Structures are given as structure tokens and as C-alpha cells.
Amino acid sequence: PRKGPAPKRPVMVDPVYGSPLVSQLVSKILLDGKKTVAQNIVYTALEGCRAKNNTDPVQTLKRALDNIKPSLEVKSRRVGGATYQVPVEVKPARQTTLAMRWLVNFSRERREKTMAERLMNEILDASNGLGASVKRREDTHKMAEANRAFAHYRW
Amino acid sequence: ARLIGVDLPRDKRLEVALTYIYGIGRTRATETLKATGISGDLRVHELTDDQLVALRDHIEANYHVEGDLRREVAADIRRKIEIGTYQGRRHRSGLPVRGQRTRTNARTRKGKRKAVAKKKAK
Amino acid sequence: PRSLKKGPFVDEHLAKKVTAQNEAGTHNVIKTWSRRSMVTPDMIGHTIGVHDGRKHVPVFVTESMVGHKLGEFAPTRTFKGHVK
Amino acid sequence: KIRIRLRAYDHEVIDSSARKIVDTVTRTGAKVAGPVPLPTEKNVFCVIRSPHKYKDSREHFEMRTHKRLIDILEPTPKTVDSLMRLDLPAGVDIEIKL
Amino acid sequence: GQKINPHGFRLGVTTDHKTRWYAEKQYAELVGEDVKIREWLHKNLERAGLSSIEIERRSERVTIFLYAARPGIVIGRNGAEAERVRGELEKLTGKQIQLNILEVKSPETDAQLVAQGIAEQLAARVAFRRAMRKAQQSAMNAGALGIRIKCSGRLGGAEMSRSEGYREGRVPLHTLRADIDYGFFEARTTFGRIGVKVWIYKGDVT
Amino acid sequence: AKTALKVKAARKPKFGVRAYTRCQRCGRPHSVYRKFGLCRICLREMAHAGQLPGVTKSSW
RNA sequence: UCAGUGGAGACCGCCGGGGUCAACUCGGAGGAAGGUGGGGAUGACGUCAAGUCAUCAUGCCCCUUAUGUCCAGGGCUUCACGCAUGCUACAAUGGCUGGUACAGAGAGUGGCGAGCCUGUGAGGGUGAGCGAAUCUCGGAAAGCCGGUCUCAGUUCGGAUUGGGGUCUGCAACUCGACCUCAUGAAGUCGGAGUCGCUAGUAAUCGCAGAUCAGCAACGCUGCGGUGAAUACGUUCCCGGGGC
RNA sequence: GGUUUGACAUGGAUCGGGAGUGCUCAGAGAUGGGUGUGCCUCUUGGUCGGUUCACAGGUGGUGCAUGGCUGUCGUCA
Ligand SMILES: CON(C)Cc1ccc(O)c2c1C[C@H]1C[C@H]3[C@H](N(C)C)C(O)=C(C(N)=O)C(=O)[C@@]3(O)C(O)=C1C2=O
Ligand SMILES: [Mg+2]
Ligand SMILES: [Mg+2]
Ligand SMILES: [Mg+2]
Ligand SMILES: [Mg+2]
Ligand SMILES: [Mg+2]
């Protein structure tokens, strides 16, 4: 807004796994205002993760988030009579938000039956380095590199 | 050709395979199962002919089904047409019969929108 | 529809007119505004001019009419189609 | 014993009437339970502000009924006569349950 | 066009209701008789000049306070007019009416009578500017802290409608603790009618 | 409203179901409150003028 | 605890910095609450010959065995179409089914009706109680838990149509709601374009009231339940403010 | 399809005692015809009747003749 940066609500931690990441994940799933449904989905996905690999589900979620985190992304610019795609570096909070949003959206887009282990499959694939989320991260980075010539328009 | 005139779809529970019959709904199928004393949670491909024909006999005895009910419904509509009631006139016109509004949509009876050219403003 | 335990509704003057017609010969047209009334077997074979808003359109009541109201056979709106 | 229900639209006159009743009965001995306040009836009316074609702007009104309760523990027929003969403001009514 | 009634705005806060009775099964019929009483009194006692009609009820008995500038018309000769209006009131309602008529200490300060007088002058075809200035000057001679008068309509018998107004002092319409008396009347002329509205800031109240 | 309509509404109907309310001050047939008769406009103006006991503006 | 009367409490008042000072501003303590704490009421001078002669009132004009007025029937509910506001959806964060938690705000004597009996049910028959912080509406739903369906134009969706009914009403043909049996349409997330929202908000979940015999209410005004994401910023779009 | 001082007001006269209604008949109903019941004071009122007389009635016109009320720019400064 014009007035200034609005305050941010503090992020709570998940009672079970003790990480703000899982709370952010459930709040991102969180369709229709059904917190209990969303975190049932999230807990089921994390338990499926620890079932298929011995490593900790919170650690595998973290690894997936780092594999989906974008470093820079392009935004539209109205310089002159044509629009430009100016690449801009992404702050850690913004990139965590982008990673979570992409993870959730592509989990919803996956072909498997149930959301819980659609999200589980997507998390495992991202942690390994595969999947639609990682593909989108690579594509956005590729397009930022293609339009890298406009790094001097940053303000 | 499993039941009267319809083939029950394999790998589907009996309680809904029965509803697959014309003239049989959810509650009608449930009654039928309770009368015949046949479970409803077993797939159709495990159905012995004796219980199959017992179910067929119960349905045929109690219920108007398939061609019979279809002919009865067509006869009722034709009777409305030939008597000339308001409902019959709406049936002939292919327009809603149960006092539905026809100004805005009435679409499931009027078919797809056949848009027409109208007067043009200046 | 009307409750069964209340019986059919015949407008109590249409009934008396059709009864008089039965007593004195079932040959006359009975003019009425009682679209409200229920067709009954006792009037079968009569001809009744049911008002439709502007004219008493005649209907010859047959066997199958009985389960219907008098006004069902006297359409009130004319459409004929849009354009021509 | 002996119920007194007071109902009005203004809590000032409700309180004044309750104080008058309790001070009267006491002046005639009769110790009496304190005036206990019942929940206030809250009727709400929404009205289109304009006389025509303006529905998004409306005015809301309430009719709040304030109710108080008095118990006359002591029978005291003298207080009975006093409570039937005294005068109360027009806005508040009285209900005596013997 | 977009201003609230000052009396309704301050109702319950500073000013009080004109009717004081309680009834929960007859409420509508008592409202109807009250409307009949007020309409009858207004229609038949214009000459006296009515500031307010205040209605009370105890038990099938109605009490009417008539705040009038000149109760001479209401009382007639030795209370004859008062008796006749009371009798008409029983005829109209069917209940025991106790009617009392009260003065207004400062009719030049009460807004309703001020609107009464301004509308009467407009009907008698006095220049509206002169009438408004006279009313304003009289109000401030009395000692009101603020006057505001607005006459709207075919002022001066013209064709277009105007909304001419006068004001000085202070009239804080937005302040609830501000004691603002509001009056309105309609001058019935040969050219429709003129709406005269008067706000008078009596002072500040708790 | 029309005077004939007002008097017809006042008089007892032929069939009980045929009765209706009418604004008892105004004659308006729409938006008439059972609690106190009157109508939308009549309620608003009379509540503002203060002739309706207990009725005040609500701003909860 | 609550009910409802009367008080207290927040004032940049205290502490520190900035601010020539000064208004303000930043941080901190205390505190339920901190910089207007949240929301409502409140709409300046005026603008648009904006709306309303149909709520009422009224100038002038017009009607006066009719443009008054009464009545029955009809219409305001039409349907090649177009727009607009909504509702239900297109399913698995879901459908069905059994069990089991947690509300608020309201209404009620031609009314709210418990309980019992009867019916598949709408309902019917009896029928207490309550003019109501007492009695009734009453069940909250979402949710949780168990079972089941297994991606299927479906056990999604519930339009339409056929049968049998109930209730209100003098009367449900035109033109009512509801129950039940059967029927099972389009719809696979929607083109250009466009809308709402900055927090207990959006999203969703049910509940109550006004009018009202009944009800086409999915509307309107309220009520609580669950409960987010994001705001770098003013470059651009729309509206506005000072010079 | 009925009605014409009218469905409803207010006031003068003029003939009055019932008005107003119960049951029936005809009618789609309005309405009309039956039949029962029939003022309280008082010698001059309440109530109604006609005939009139005044008059009523209009959701008929003009929101660009108006009042009132409201939207709106705009919670804008
Ligand atoms: C036609 O008669 N002559 C020529 C002038 C005229 C005369 C008398 C009137 O009483 C009006 C008018 C013009 C119309 C125009 C209307 C129109 N509207 C109906 C869409 C409009 O475009 C607006 C607007 N958007 O602002 C208006 O102003 C409007 O509503 C209005 O006020 C009007 C009137 O009533
Ligand atoms: Mg009605
Ligand atoms: Mg303010
Ligand atoms: Mg205009
Ligand atoms: Mg007119
Ligand atoms: Mg319509």
C-alpha cells in the first residue's frame, strides 16, 4: 500500500514435527478454511514420506523446498511502447512462499487419486530433483537467464 | 442380458447394479435386496443363477421395469397430448409443463440457445 | 393437489347445474367461470363453456377428463409464435 | 413470595420505579429481595431509507424492553395495599403475582 | 437530501420520546389512536400554534400535554373550547382523556413555532428574506447560540425552485451532546407549498 | 393509497384468507409491520419524530 | 459464569531517541488493550432540472351514468431470444452411511409446541408447557471417528419428466410449497473480458428474523462456527486531494 | 357483468323509525327478492333512509411547478 509495509503475522510451528515449514504447508493447502482436513492431508503425506524413505519427513520436505526455491524471477515492465521481462532477485521469504505454492499446486495437478499422497509423491520427487515443481523452477530460472540483459532496470 | 433386459456391469456392487435397471432406484434396489435376502456388498460376477433368478422373479412380480414402464410413461404423455390439457399442450410445444418460468432459461426443455438477430440501435 | 380427505372441489353451482341438466336431459351448454372446479363423472358427456379470461370456450367433457380441473382445457394465454 | 415484574423502555425509569417499590415495602417493614435485572428484549427493524428504488442504504431501529424482578418475602397485607395503591410513571408497567 | 433528523439522531441520547406508555398486545392500535389524536389536533388547532403533543397512558386513560404558544385559542372562553376539544377527543378515541395545555416560555426560541411563524408569513406573502431575517434576529435577541433557517420551494411565487437559507452563530448538527431543537412547517401558498426548516442551538447538555 | 381500497381493506373480507394489512397511517400495502402497524416510511418518520416509545436508532 | 445498572481504564500519560525546538515520529515499560484498539451511528457548501405526483402532501391541467366505484374470471408467472444478480454443480480436501462433539443471535397465544401413538415420509391424531433467562422452536452444520464407494459422465451432478400423496386456503388449471416412487439432462472448471476482499477479513458452514394462511426465500437484514494467502512497492490502470 | 351524492367523508334541509343483521331464494359474484328480529331519550337527541343540495372520488397528467424523503460524487478534506 501507499502508507508502508504492512505488518506480517507471525508463523506458528507444527505441534507434531516442531517446524514452521509444516505449518506453512498446511496453511497453504488449507482449502475452504478446513484446517483439520488440510493438516490430516499433510500429516498423511509426511508419514508416507517417512514410510518410503527412512529419512525424516521434515528433512525431506526441506530438501524439496530447497530444490523448488527460485533464485530470481522476471516481472513485467512498462518501459517504452513494449513490455519487458526484468529479472529480479527473490528474497528468502518470497522464494519459500513460491516453492510452497508451486509444490501445492502441482500436487493438486498430479494424476494420482488422493491429495494426501499426490502431495507425498510430489514431495519425494522434488526432493530427489524431479517433478513438475522442479521443472517450473528450472523454466523460470531459464527465462530469467534469457532476459538477464535487463538486470540494470532494477530500482 | 443379465437381468430383465439389461446387463449388470461386472465388478460393480449389486446394490447399484440393481439401480442400473430402468424403473429401479436406490431405495427400490435396497428393498429388493432385503426382500430377496441377498447381500448388496458383493460384486455381480459372484452371483449364482438361483439367487439371480430369485431376484429377477421378485423384481418382475413387484415392479414395473424396463419396457413396460417406458411404454406406460409414453402412454401417459400421449394421453395428456390427446386429452389436450395445459400440460399436454406444453408437452406438444416441447416446453416446461410444471409451471416453470420460460422467460429467461427453460433450457433443458428448449434445447440449446438458437440466438436470433434483433433490432439494432443507432 | 387437493387433500384426498377433503374430497374433490366442485364449485357447488356447477354441480347443481350439471345435476339439473342430468335430470332434465343431458343436452345444453353450461356456461361457467369455474375454472376452479374438478371434473366429475356425473358431468361426463356434457359441454361446459369454461371462461378463459375473455370468452367461454366450450369443452366437451369425455371419460378421461375426470381427473382434471375445468380450467386445464381453457388456455388463457395466446402465443402463436414470435415473429411470423 | 409475591412477584413484582417491572417492564419499560428506559432503564432510568425502570431503576427509579424499582427503588420506589423497594423503599415503600421496606418503609412498611417487609424485607424484599433486591431488584434483579432480566435480559432486555431486543427487537430490530431494518427499513429502506428512501421511499423508492434505493435499497442499499437502510436505517436500523431497536425497541429495547428492560425488565426487573422484585420478590416480597414478607406477606405484609399493609404492603399489599401500598403496592396496589401507589402511583408509577406511565412508561413503566407493573405485574403483581400473588 | 442526505441529512438526518436532529431529533431522531439525538433521540435517547439527549432528547426524549413524545409518547410514554408500555403495551405489548395493542401496541399497534394505541399507535393508531395516537396518530388520530395528533392529526386531529394539528388539523383543528393551527391557530394556537402547536410546539408538541405529548401522550401518556396508564390504564385505558390517555393524558395529552399540548405545548402551545398561545393557549388562548385552545381554552376559548372559560375553558369552553378546552371542554369541546376534550369531548371531541373522547368521541374520536373512546377513552378517558385528561388534557392539559402548557405554555412555551420562549416561542421565539422554540424552532417549531419559529417555522410556524415563517410559514404563516410566507403564506401571507411576505418577502422571504425579510421573514427569515426577522426570525433570526428575534432568536438571537432571545439568546439562542445559533440559528439556521432554510426555505425551499417556489419562493416568491417563481417558477424555478430555490433553497434560500440564513444562519449565524453556531449550529453543530454533528455533535450529539449539542442541544439542537428542530422544527419544520409548510407554507401553503397559491403556488404549491414552501418547506421551512429551522435549527436552533439551545446550548450544550450532558 | 386509494380511499376505496383503504375502506375495503378495513371492512371484514368475504373469505378470511382475503384480508391484508395496509399502513394504518398511510394506506401503503407494502412493508407493513405487525408490531405497530404503519409502514416503511411511516415507521422511519415517526421513529425519528419520537412518537413511537422504545423505538430508537440502532448502531450496535 | 452470566444477566444489567453505575464506576474505573488509554491520555503519546511514563522512559529513551529523532524532531532548531514544535507539532509529530521511532523504540520500550506497564497493561486486557498503544499511538484512532475493532465496528456502527453520524454524510460539510454543493453537484447531477439525479429518483420518487405510486408512501404521503401539493400548484396547475384533465375524468365525472366515467380516467369514479363494486364483482367474477384473466394478467402481472407469456418465450425464437439478450443482459444482470444469485444458487447448485462439474466430484475423492469428495459422495453415501452409522456414531459422536462445540454456538451465537433471535421468535412465540388464530402463536411456539414438547411427549406418546400412527405413517416410508411430508404429515395426521391426541396433546402438556410457555406471553416466556423458566416452555417451545432445538437439530446447530462444517468437524472428529468407523464403514463404504475407487476416478467411472460415476454411488459426481439433480435438471427435466411420469405416478402416488400431504398441508395451507372459499380455491393450488393457469400459478404454491413439501413428501415419496421412478426418470437421471447439461456440466470434465468455463472465450474475450470482468468482480470481491488487507484479519477473525476472504473462503466456506449452518442458524434466526422481517413480510407471511401458505410460499416460488437460492432474496434481504442479522448471528455465530471453521478460518487463510499476500501487500517488494507507486512505474502503469481507475477515482480523488493540496499547490 | 353491476352501480351513479356514488365504495368512503363533511354539512344543511326533508320524510322517518329502526339501523344493522340471522335463515332462505336467484346469481360467477356484485347485487336483487324473501323471512325472522327489531332504536335509546323524549314531544324535542343518538341512528339511518331517500330526494336532492352542497359535494365526494382518481395509483389520471406534469419529479423540468413543488414540499418531504433518498441516491450520488464522498468518510472525500
Ligand atoms: C426528455 O425531455 N427533455 C428532452 C429533457 C427533460 C425534460 C424534463 C425532464 O423531467 C427530464 C428531461 C431529460 C431526461 C434525461 C434523463 C435520462 N435518463 C432517463 C436515462 C438521462 O440520460 C439522465 C442521466 N443519465 O443523468 C437524466 O438526467 C434524466 O434522467 C432526466 O433527469 C430527464 C428528465 O426527467
Ligand atoms: Mg395475504
Ligand atoms: Mg464524526
Ligand atoms: Mg429527470
Ligand atoms: Mg394526483
Ligand atoms: Mg413480475
Ligand SMILES: [Mg+2]
Ligand atoms: Mg414476546
Ligand SMILES: [Mg+2]
Ligand atoms: Mg482497507
Ligand SMILES: [Mg+2]
Ligand atoms: Mg429532480
Ligand SMILES: [Mg+2]
Ligand atoms: Mg422518471
Ligand SMILES: [Zn+2]
Ligand atoms: Zn405509510
